Amino acid sequence: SSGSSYPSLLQCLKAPVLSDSSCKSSYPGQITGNMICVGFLEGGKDSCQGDSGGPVVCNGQLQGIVSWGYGCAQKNKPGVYTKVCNYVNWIQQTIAAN
Amino acid sequence: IVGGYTCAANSIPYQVSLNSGSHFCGGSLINSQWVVSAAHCYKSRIQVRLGEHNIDVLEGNEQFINAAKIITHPNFNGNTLDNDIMLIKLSSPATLNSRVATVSLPRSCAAAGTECLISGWGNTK
Numbered sequence A: 001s002s003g004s005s006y007p008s009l010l011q012c013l014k015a016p017v018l019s020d021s022s023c024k025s026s027y028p029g030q031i032t033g034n035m036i037c038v039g040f041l042e043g044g045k046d047s048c049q050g051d052s053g054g055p056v057v058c059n060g061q062l063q064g065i066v067s068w069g070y071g072c073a074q075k076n077k078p079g080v081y082t083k084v085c086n087y088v089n090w091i092q093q094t095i096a097a098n
Numbered sequence B: 001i002v003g004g005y006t007c008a009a010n011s012i013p014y015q016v017s018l019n020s021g022s023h024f025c026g027g028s029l030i031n032s033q034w035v036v037s038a039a040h041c042y043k044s045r046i047q048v049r050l051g052e053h054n055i056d057v058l059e060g061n062e063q064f065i066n067a068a069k070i071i072t073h074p075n076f077n078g079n080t081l082d083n084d085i086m087l088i089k090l091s092s093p094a095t096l097n098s099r100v101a102t103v104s105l106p107r108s109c110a111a112a113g114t115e116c117l118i119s120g121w122g123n124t125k
């Protein structure tokens, strides 16, 4: 159930992976190697609260997990996503043993 | 999702809603028993809702399955959200069909500029 603020219907957004340098420049001191920025430096289009945990899928492959950002859809503050191509071995080994 | 569009119903069949009375987070189905999500979405009990489009209305394609295991990445940092990843084991396997399906894990990292699809039931303003 969507409660007080969330939409009832699943929402979709097309957005590009951003360079690591743009991601670090947007969030100085806060980006690790396990994070990627996806979205628009001009703002206006982004994920937001309630989206965390959900997918970023590129060419049929899960590359990001909705994680955090400053505000939503703010200028020079694109969404920050967990970088899934760092974790395939953690995922496969955890599934294999549990 | 701010500035997006409404997905066609069940066109994102790997998208799940994590529910503890109401929707609070998303996730992605990666095999019939496992959902990957974010570690800061951790709760001691989670119901996984698959096959959803309208999360407020029963439409007929839903599967509601409670989590049996919830495993956060051991090096998750709650202050910085580093290693923000979590795996949820379903207490029974989801039935895979045309509206409930898995998404592939990556064979390499995506290049800057690659177009991707992001989805969810998060705030739209």
Ligand SMILES: [Ca+2]
Pocket: B052, B053, B054, B055, B056, B057, B058, B059, B062
């Ligand atoms: Ca529904």
